[PDB]
């Protein structure tokens, strides 16, 4: 039936990290609050993961996942050339995020990082965010 | 991972694009043609050998069976060798009729 709820432990975070990768992964997909909550619902629905686990550090640059074992961090994506990323947008995806949705103005995309299983960067670098 | 544009892929990419703002009603140009080429080469690794449209005056039909987009003239009363403004129009019946090959097999 429905998977019983369970919190994302360290081992579960790794297994879910690879489960999402095997499902195609999130590489290079642009981050967003809506995509964030969609990811949350996907793991509750298919795997019963209580969705109190997906959070990222806030400083500029890499946004490290605050649950240790989650291997999908956020990275800033480089400036889009004036020509022709705006014509590309009109042509294909006319509905764009505003970069100032992020407090640092940075456009964020998911990136996979296996080393995040061996260093809890979020807590090692920014303990004050806990 | 370059992959070539199959029928099922053309259907899906047709739908993905149409789902979003997509190409609907947008003025066609040789520039915008290549931009679409790149955006698909990059975002899905599709060799850009698929997006051709039949030549003559009138509606231009896509030469990849499964690509659900054609080019339609806009009434008004230039880039086009026939003297027409062209616009992208989604058309789901191209899933079931290879109009390009039916009407103009010459171009194959």
Numbering used by the authors:
A (entry chain B): 104 to 233
B (entry chain A): 107 to 183, 203 to 233
What does the paper say about this structure?
The Nef protein of human (HIV) and simian (SIV) immunodeficiency viruses is an important replication and pathogenicity factor. Nef-mediated internalization of CD4 from the surface of infected cells is highly conserved among primate lentiviruses and thought to promote the release of fully infectious viral particles and to prevent superinfection. Nef stimulates clathrin-mediated endocytosis of CD3, CD4 and other cellular receptors by acting as an adapter of the adapter protein machinery. Our study thus provides insights into the molecular basis for the versatility of Nef as an adapter protein for the internalization of surface molecules containing endocytic sorting motifs.
